[PDB]
Amino acid sequence: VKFQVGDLVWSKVGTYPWWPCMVSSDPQLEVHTKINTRGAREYHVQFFSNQPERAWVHEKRVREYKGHKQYEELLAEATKIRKPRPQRERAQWDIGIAHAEKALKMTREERIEQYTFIYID
């Protein structure tokens, strides 16, 4: 268990680029971490994204969020060629990054209070 509730992380899911997140407890499972059906560790995260999104993410697809400029180092893990991404996706990623930068300046307690999602039945 490398991450705790309120920790800022980058998550790599589906076809999306490394995305700013906050580790949180799953509302149903009441844990922020678990071992999956394949025996691998996963963390529950909330994305700093337009549609309120949460996901169980494989530990290998999660990295500590040290700052927005860390993005180049994440790409370097795969390693002049650059991959494009839609402008609309970049715009939503920039808003999420802006939220993550504000969250990074807070204490873990402040961040949990400010950003944890409200779940409705």
Ligand X SMILES: O=C(O)c1ccccc1/C=C/c1cccs1
User: How many residues does the structure list for the chain?
Assistant: 121
In the region spanning residues 30 to 69, those forming contacts with ligand X, defined by CB under 6 A, are 48-50
CB 48, CB 65: distance < 8 Å: no
83 vs 85: CA distance, rounded Å: 7
Task: Single out the segment in contact with ligand X by CB under 6 A; choices: 5-13, 29-37, 69-77, 89-97.
Answer: 89-97
Q: How far is the CB of 21 from ligand X (least distance, A)?
A: 9
42 vs 63: CA distance, rounded Å: 12
- Residue showing the smallest CB distance to ligand X in the complex: 95
95 binds ligand X (CB under 6 A): yes
Q: Is the Cβ of residue 41 or residue 104 nearer to ligand X in the bound state?
A: 104
CB 21, CB 51: distance < 8 Å: no
Binding site for ligand X (CB under 6 A): 48-50, 92, 95-96, 99, 115
